[PDB]
Amino acid sequence: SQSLYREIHQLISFKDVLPDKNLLPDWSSNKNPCTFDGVTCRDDKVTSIDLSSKPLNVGFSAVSSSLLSLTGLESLFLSNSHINGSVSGFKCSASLTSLDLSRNSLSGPVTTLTSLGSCSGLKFLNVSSNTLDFPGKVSGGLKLNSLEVLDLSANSISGANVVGWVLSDGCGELKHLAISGNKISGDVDVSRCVNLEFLDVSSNNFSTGIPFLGDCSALQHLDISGNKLSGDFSRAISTCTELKLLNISSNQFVGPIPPLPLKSLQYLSLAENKFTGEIPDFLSGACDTLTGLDLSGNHFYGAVPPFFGSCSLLESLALSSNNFSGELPMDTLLKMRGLKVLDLSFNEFSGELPESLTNLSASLLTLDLSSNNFSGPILPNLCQNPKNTLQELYLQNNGFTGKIPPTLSNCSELVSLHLSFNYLSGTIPSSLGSLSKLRDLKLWLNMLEGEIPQELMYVKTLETLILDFNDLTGEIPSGLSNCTNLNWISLSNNRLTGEIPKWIGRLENLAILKLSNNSFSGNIPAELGDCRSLIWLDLNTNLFNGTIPAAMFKQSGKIAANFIAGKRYVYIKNDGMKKECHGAGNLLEFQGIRSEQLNRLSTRNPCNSRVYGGHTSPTFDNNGSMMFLDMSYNMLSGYIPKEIGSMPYLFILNLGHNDISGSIPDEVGDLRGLNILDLSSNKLDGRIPQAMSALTMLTEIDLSNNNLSGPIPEMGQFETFPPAKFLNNPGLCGYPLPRCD
Numbered sequence: 001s002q003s004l005y006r007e008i009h010q011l012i013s014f015k016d017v018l019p020d021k022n023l024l025p026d027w028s029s030n031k032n033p034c035t036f037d038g039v040t041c042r043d044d045k046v047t048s049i050d051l052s053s054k055p056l057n058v059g060f061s062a063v064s065s066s067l068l069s070l071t072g073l074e075s076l077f078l079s080n081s082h083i084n085g086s087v088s089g090f091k092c093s094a095s096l097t098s099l100d101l102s103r104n105s106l107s108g109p110v111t112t113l114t115s116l117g118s119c120s121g122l123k124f125l126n127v128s129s130n131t132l133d134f135p136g137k138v139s140g141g142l143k144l145n146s147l148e149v150l151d152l153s154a155n156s157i158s159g160a161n162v163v164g165w166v167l168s169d170g171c172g173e174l175k176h177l178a179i180s181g182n183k184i185s186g187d188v189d190v191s192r193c194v195n196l197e198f199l200d201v202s203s204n205n206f207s208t209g210i211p212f213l214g215d216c217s218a219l220q221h222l223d224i225s226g227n228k229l230s231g232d233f234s235r236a237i238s239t240c241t242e243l244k245l246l247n248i249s250s251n252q253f254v255g256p257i258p259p260l261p262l263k264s265l266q267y268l269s270l271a272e273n274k275f276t277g278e279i280p281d282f283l284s285g286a287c288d289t290l291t292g293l294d295l296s297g298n299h300f301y302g303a304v305p306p307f308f309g310s311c312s313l314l315e316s317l318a319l320s321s322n323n324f325s326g327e328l329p330m331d332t333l334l335k336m337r338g339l340k341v342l343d344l345s346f347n348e349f350s351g352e353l354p355e356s357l358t359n360l361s362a363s364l365l366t367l368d369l370s371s372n373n374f375s376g377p378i379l380p381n382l383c384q385n386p387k388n389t390l391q392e393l394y395l396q397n398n399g400f401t402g403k404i405p406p407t408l409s410n411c412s413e414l415v416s417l418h419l420s421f422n423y424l425s426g427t428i429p430s431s432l433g434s435l436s437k438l439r440d441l442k443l444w445l446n447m448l449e450g451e452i453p454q455e456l457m458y459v460k461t462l463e464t465l466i467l468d469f470n471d472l473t474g475e476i477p478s479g480l481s482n483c484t485n486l487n488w489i490s491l492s493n494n495r496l497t498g499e500i501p502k503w504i505g506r507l508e509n510l511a512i513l514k515l516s517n518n519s520f521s522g523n524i525p526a527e528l529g530d531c532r533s534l535i536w537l538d539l540n541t542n543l544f545n546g547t548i549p550a551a552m553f554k555q556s557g558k559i560a561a562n563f564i565a566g567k568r569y570v571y572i573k574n575d576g577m578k579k580e581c582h583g584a585g586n587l588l589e590f591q592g593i594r595s596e597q598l599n600r601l602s603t604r605n606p607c608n609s610r611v612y613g614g615h616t617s618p619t620f621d622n623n624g625s626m627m628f629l630d631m632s633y634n635m636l637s638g639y640i641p642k643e644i645g646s647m648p649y650l651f652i653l654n655l656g657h658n659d660i661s662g663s664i665p666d667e668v669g670d671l672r673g674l675n676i677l678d679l680s681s682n683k684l685d686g687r688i689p690q691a692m693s694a695l696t697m698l699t700e701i702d703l704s705n706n707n708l709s710g711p712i713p714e715m716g717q718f719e720t721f722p723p724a725k726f727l728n729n730p731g732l733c734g735y736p737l738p739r740c741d
């Protein structure tokens with residue numbers, strides 16, 4: 001036929017306008033398209049093309065002129081294909097049924113989509129994750145009332161009543177509307193959409209009316225979360241008898257949990273609102289269908305109603321960040337046959353752990369009991385039940401006394417263990433080396449003694465070791481050389497000894513090494529310079545000596561950090577007020593702990609009030625450098641190597657209280673991101689290099705107690721700092737000091 005001749009010529013003309021033609025290397029003229037990678041054929045005719053996740057790097061016009069006009073094409077999938085430009089009028093084949101253009105760079109007003117009406121058979125349209133917008137006045141209509149599925153999520157659509165604009169010309173055919181991740185406001189009226197099954201209007205700018213749903217005859221999925229809605233949603237969804245998922249989380253709802261349609265309900269989320277009072281007895285009505293419940297981050301209180309035993313289908317129960325109290329209602333949890341995730345974190349549950357809990361170790365994937373008021377010992381008999389499935393165990397920030405049960409090694413599926421912030425004595429059981437899947441061992445702020453288990457080598461998956469604030473002794477176990485995935489090692493405020501092993505250079509994933517306030521010694525390993533993920537080095541308050549190896553900076557400009565991101569931390573800034581408190585500040589892991597309990601450190605730390613929190617976020621993804629370097633309060637000597645200046649992402653530099661001599665390298669002036677510079681109490685001499693006048697981001701400097709001399713630089717930021725920062729430098733003069741003689 002002709003369409004065959006035309007099919008091949010159209011496909012090859014498309015290939016030919018690609019900047020990287022090597023992308024469709026098996027496409028070629030005088031070959032049958034049905035043999036082409038990306039092509040679906042039925043009876044020797046093209047019915048579908050899928051060029052998704054290939055960087056085609058061409059514009060929509062190339063697509064609509066070559067591809068969308070092919071006779072018989074039924075579906076075109078071009079998600080994440082680097083298509084830019086915008087939709088305009090074109091001839092479209094009547095067979096085309098699905099168009100997926102999601103995750104591209106389509107730009108322009110959302111009114112451009114209206115020109116896709118050329119496609120008389122189009123029923124499914126995904127244009128999510130682009131940059132389509134709605135400039136100014138919202139008038140007219142989208143005019144695609146034949147659609148069954150429309151996805152406009154994650155665009156740049158800012159406007160009021162955009163939904164009415166979408167639905168203006170009719171929605172009798174519409175089954176699934178998603179438009180989340182925009183900035184849409186106003187009214188949502190889908191009452192004329194009597195076949196609508198799926199509505200996601202989440203993460204927008206709604207702060208007035210609740211969506212109006214009319215008879216709600218077909219609605220199964222309703223997501224209005226992530227807005228600023230308040231008011232009577234109970235009445236709005238009261239006609240909704242087929243509802244399976246109701247997500248109203250992250251809004252401004254207040255009062256008690258009101259009546260709900262439970263007979264079909266599988267997923268319910270009320271999280272992150274201002275609901276008050278206690279879980280009502282009437283929710284037992286969903287115990288026949290309910291698979292997921294989330295009431296986290298409200299003001300709920302009291303106990304977990306006993307009715308939950310009937311919710312035998314309930315897989316996840318999340319109630320964290322309320323004020324639930326009482327003992328672990330094991331009598332109810334043991335009936336929830338299907339329970340997999342249990343999250344009661346950040347409440348005020350109390351008492352010891354009931355012995356019956358050891359049964360759930362054979363069904364649960366996650367047990368999150370962090371930040372409560374539990375007391376007593378960790379159940380030794382825990383994970384007796386053969387085939388222990390438990391993956392995550394979070395018991396941090398409670399009142400647990402006793403030893404760490406070696407029995408925990410039987411929970412062989414364990415990926416995450418967090419026993420921090422308790423009162424645990426005894427040693428770190430050697431048997432934890434048996435947890436072949438463990439990624440996180442977090443035991444910080446307890447009273448753990450003895451040495452760090454050599455047997456920890458037997459854990460190949462290990463990524464984080466957080467042992468700060470204990471009573472550990474002995475040296476860094478040579479065995480740890482084996483855990484090559486470590487990206488965060490924190491051993492501060494113990495009584496460790498020995499040197500820093502030279503095998504640290506081995507771990508190419510280590511991003512944070514914190515060894516402060518112990519008794520480590522010897523020289524700084526030039527081997528640290530071999531770590532290619534290292535961004536935070538805190539060796540303060542120890543007994544290291546020798547000279548700062550220039551080699552430790554060899555990685556600067558090559559540093560990659562990706563795995564360390566997204567982890568909750570607190571950074572506690574040192575105010576130079578108390579002389580017993582050392583270092584720039586303490587970076588501490590802080591997943592599942594209340595800041596209100598930082599006061600617990602008072603007895604272990606001479607530091608008093610300045611707490612930064614967040615989630616780790618490197619300032620680059622690649623080609624970075626160290627961001628933090630503290631070696632204060634040691635016995636280092638010799639001169640600062642000029643390579644010190646080679647780290648453009650360095651925010652903090654503390655080398656204070658050592659025996660460093662010679663003169664401040666002029667390369668410090670290259671450290672353009674520097675916020676803090678402490679070189680106090682050393683033996684540095686010569687002149688403050690004028691180059692340092694180029695630093696623009698210094699919020700703090702200290703050069704006091706050296707043998708520096710000559711004039712303080714008048715340009716840059718020096719005039720900004722008080723005299724104290726320069727005291728005890730005999731030959732030093734110039735404002736803020738007395739003028740030079």
Ligand SMILES: *[C@@H]1O[C@H](CO)[C@@H](O[C@@H]2O[C@H](CO)[C@@H](O[C@@H]3O[C@H](CO)[C@@H](O)[C@H](O[C@H]4O[C@H](CO)[C@@H](O)[C@H](O)[C@@H]4O)[C@@H]3O)[C@H](O)[C@H]2NC(C)=O)[C@H](O)[C@H]1NC(C)=O
Nearest residue numbers: 079080100102103125126127128129149150151154176178
């Ligand atoms: C409009 O297009 C968007 C963008 O593609 C689309 O959203 C994305 O959908 C996909 C699935 O269709 C999501 O990817 C999933 O992510 C989950 C984790 O959250 C994974 O578990 C899933 O993996 C499963 O399936 C894979 C094969 O697809 C298997 O390899 C794997 O083993 C699992 O079985 C899956 O990868 C994606 O997260 C969303 N979100 C994005 C990218 O924004 C959206 O659904 C489209 N809209 C409509 C109406 O179709």
Ligand SMILES: *[C@@H]1O[C@H](CO)[C@@H](O[C@@H]2O[C@H](CO)[C@@H](O[C@@H]3O[C@H](CO)[C@@H](O)[C@H](O[C@H]4O[C@H](CO)[C@@H](O)[C@H](O)[C@@H]4O)[C@@H]3O)[C@H](O)[C@H]2NC(C)=O)[C@H](O)[C@H]1NC(C)=O
Nearest residue numbers: 154155180181182202203225226247248249250267269272
């Ligand atoms: C019930 O609803 C809640 C609340 O909406 C929901 O949890 C949320 O999931 C969404 C994903 O749909 C999360 O949103 C993302 O947050 C991450 C992390 O900060 C961001 O990186 C993401 O930004 C991207 O996507 C945006 C579009 O949504 C884009 O505009 C942006 O440019 C980025 O590409 C995104 O915002 C959100 O973090 C959570 N919220 C909370 C509080 O957990 C939950 O999953 C729902 N439950 C069920 C089962 O449906």
Ligand SMILES: *[C@@H]1O[C@H](CO)[C@@H](O[C@@H]2O[C@H](CO)[C@@H](O[C@@H]3O[C@H](CO)[C@@H](O)[C@H](O[C@H]4O[C@H](CO)[C@@H](O)[C@H](O)[C@@H]4O)[C@@H]3O)[C@H](O)[C@H]2NC(C)=O)[C@H](O)[C@H]1NC(C)=O
Nearest residue numbers: 493494517518541580581582583601602603604605606607
């Ligand atoms: C490096 O490690 C060591 C080991 O922790 C650390 O020494 C400890 O410092 C803390 C905090 O200063 C000390 O805690 C004190 O304990 C005594 C009793 O032994 C108490 O009397 C003290 O109480 C005072 O402060 C309280 C509030 O914090 C007040 O309520 C009270 O009225 C008192 O004023 C205080 O809690 C602890 O004794 C030492 N332990 C050791 C081993 O010496 C050291 O400070 C760390 N170094 C650095 C640089 O951080």
Ligand SMILES: CC(C)[C@H](C)[C@@H](O)[C@H](O)[C@@H](C)[C@H]1CC[C@H]2[C@@H]3COC(=O)[C@H]4C[C@H](O)[C@H](O)C[C@]4(C)[C@H]3CC[C@]12C
Nearest residue numbers: 536569571573587612615616617618619651675676699
């Ligand atoms: C990359 C991570 C490991 C890291 C924790 C990161 O996520 C985090 O944002 C870091 C970069 C933060 C945590 C503490 C922050 C510092 C807080 O303490 C310092 O006093 C302030 C003072 C002042 O505000 C300066 O502008 C920056 C400055 C000095 C901050 C520099 C950036 C931080 C160091």
Ligand SMILES: *[C@@H]1O[C@H](CO)[C@@H](O)[C@H](O)[C@H]1NC(C)=O
Nearest residue numbers: 057058059083084085086107
């Ligand atoms: C589309 O992307 C290409 C590649 O960068 C560019 O040359 C062209 O100008 C872009 N078109 C639009 C509309 O931005």
Ligand SMILES: *[C@@H]1O[C@H](CO)[C@@H](O)[C@H](O)[C@H]1NC(C)=O
Nearest residue numbers: 158160183185186205206207
């Ligand atoms: C959300 O809507 C309000 C009211 O229309 C508007 O004033 C505001 O600009 C919008 N906020 C955002 C974050 O765009």
Ligand SMILES: *[C@@H]1O[C@H](CO)[C@@H](O)[C@H](O)[C@H]1NC(C)=O
Nearest residue numbers: 301302322323324325326348
């Ligand atoms: C939370 O519950 C506890 C224990 O019953 C109660 O004493 C406390 O007042 C509650 N917290 C608040 C602030 O309501």
